Amino acid sequence: SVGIVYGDQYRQLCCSSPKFGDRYALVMDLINAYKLIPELSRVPPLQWDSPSRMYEAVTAFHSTEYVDALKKLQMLHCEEKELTADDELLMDSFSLNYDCPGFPSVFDYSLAAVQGSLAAASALICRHCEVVINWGGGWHHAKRSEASGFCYLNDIVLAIHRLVSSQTRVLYVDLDLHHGDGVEEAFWYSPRVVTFSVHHASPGFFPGTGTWNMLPIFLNGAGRGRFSAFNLPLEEGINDLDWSNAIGPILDSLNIVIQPSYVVVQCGADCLATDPHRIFRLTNFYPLSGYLYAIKKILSWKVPTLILGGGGYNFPDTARLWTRVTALTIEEVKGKKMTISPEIPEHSYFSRYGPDFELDIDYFPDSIQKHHRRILEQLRNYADLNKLIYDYDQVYQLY
Ligand SMILES: O=C(NO)c1ccc(Cl)c(NC(=O)c2ccccc2)c1
Ligand SMILES: [K+]
Ligand SMILES: [K+]
Ligand SMILES: [Zn+2]
Structure with missing residues (x-):
């Protein structure tokens, strides 16, 4: 069974931010318009018995002080009075500003993604689902006491922490345009969570990590986590094929x-290619989309898997991509063919897919x-550091 996180309240909260607007509604309604929902198990977001249990979950990674400030930020944005100088300084100490602004639902919005991804991890652990999808999750930039990149709480780190605490090894694969720095940093000293990010990197491009560190070298973990953080920075302009050949042997060897x-x-x-960043040239094409190649390869391992969202600032094309990812997950996991019309079906958000109304990006x-x-x-x-048994030449032959 393939699970997917949604809910009426979940949807409201995931659609309540100024940066991502209603993207989540488009994604889930396009999945619904394509008749995929009956193939999927609904995973409800996690809810807690008390404020103390909620704090205990979130502060498995985040500091209490940062959580407190994030909740205060919501409360301050729910009244009219301007922030005081002291409250502005407090917020600045947690980078709750500039690209991570406050808004009336900022705490509930951020927490919702944690609730979704923790429930997803739970469904894998108890073996209810072989794969779970959370298109409201994937906020990889948030740090223990710092908002970053419109990531306020790191739902990925919390989900991974639940998985590893269930010997257990987790492989994390970050396909986002941006370096997955928050997840990489959280597990910098942990060999049991191997992180792998493929991303664009170039001078001045956010967040600046995941590349040569200023012959400069690649950092890759520390302590017993040495060599456990992997990165592949790529030049702008890369297409589906080159990106697929770049990442494919790495995924298989890991x-x-x-x-x-x-x-x-x-x-x-x-x-x-149609994202406003206009950096990489990946597509959602399925004859091949680098995304669908990667996901199909990962799913072919038959390892219980969590699929999360993240960046994506062309909302209809993000929906077009994630709808195909969802259909591909059903087909790979269940062995049941998913036929998807090349034309967007009529539904709530049909007009957003103008002017051509096709599933392929334009x-x-x-x-x-x-x-x-x-x-x-x-x-x-x-x-070698972790004393793992493996065939060197089988791995070498992959490349
Ligand atoms: O996707 C992000 N992190 O995985 C992310 C992190 C930091 C930043 Cl600064 C942004 N910026 C944008 O979303 C953007 C840029 C150009 C046009 C339209 C939107 C996104
Ligand atoms: K990435
Ligand atoms: K690690
Ligand atoms: Zn991104």
Whole structure:
């Protein structure tokens, strides 16, 4: 069974932010318009017995002080009075400002994603679902005491922490345009959570990590976590095929060597050629979309898997992508063919898919070899540090 997190309240909260507007409603209504919902098990967001149990869950990663400030930020934005100088300074100390502003539902909005992704992890742990999807989750930039990149609470870290505390190894795969720095940092010292981000990196591009660290070198973990954080920064302009060839052997080698108990995939849609960032040239095409190639490969491992959203600022094209990811997950997990019309069906948000109303996005389509050698050596070093049994040449042959 394939689970997916939704709910009426969940939907309201996921649609209450100024940056992401109603993207979540488009995604779930397009999934519904394509008649995928009856194939999927609804996973309800987690709710708690008391404020103390809620704090205990969230502060498994975040500091109490940051959680307190985030809740105060919501309360301050629910009254009319301007913030005081002291409250502005408090908020600045947690980077609750600039690109992570307050708004009337900021705490409930942020928490909802945590509630969704923790319930998703639970459904995998008890074996109710083989795969769970949460298109309201994936907020990989939030840090223990710092908002970042419109990420206020890191639902991924909390879900992964629940998975590993259930020996258990989690492989985290971050397909977002941006480096998954918050998840990487949370598990920097943990060999049991191997993180892998593929992303654009270049001078001045957010958040600035996931690349050569200023012959400069790649940091990759520390302590017993040495060699356990993997990164693949890519030049702008990369298409589906090159991105797929870049990531494919890495994914397979990580699975062979790490043998994860769970995979967690962030599927940020900002690599689409039609995303406003206009950096990568990925598509949602399915004859091949780099996203669908990656997800199909990961699912072919038959490891219990969490699929999360993330970036994606062209809301209809993010819906078009994540609808195909959802249909692909059903087909791969259940072995049951999913036929998706190339035309958007009529539904609530039909007009948002103008002017053509097609499921395809509207787009006419040595460095990587050096990163592969680097990553293969790091993986050898990770296996050597952690005394993992594996065939070197089977792994080497993948590349
Ligand atoms: O997706 C993000 N993190 O995974 C993310 C993190 C930091 C920033 Cl600054 C942004 N920026 C945008 O969303 C954006 C940029 C150009 C046009 C329209 C929107 C996104
Ligand atoms: K990424
Ligand atoms: K790690
Ligand atoms: Zn992003």
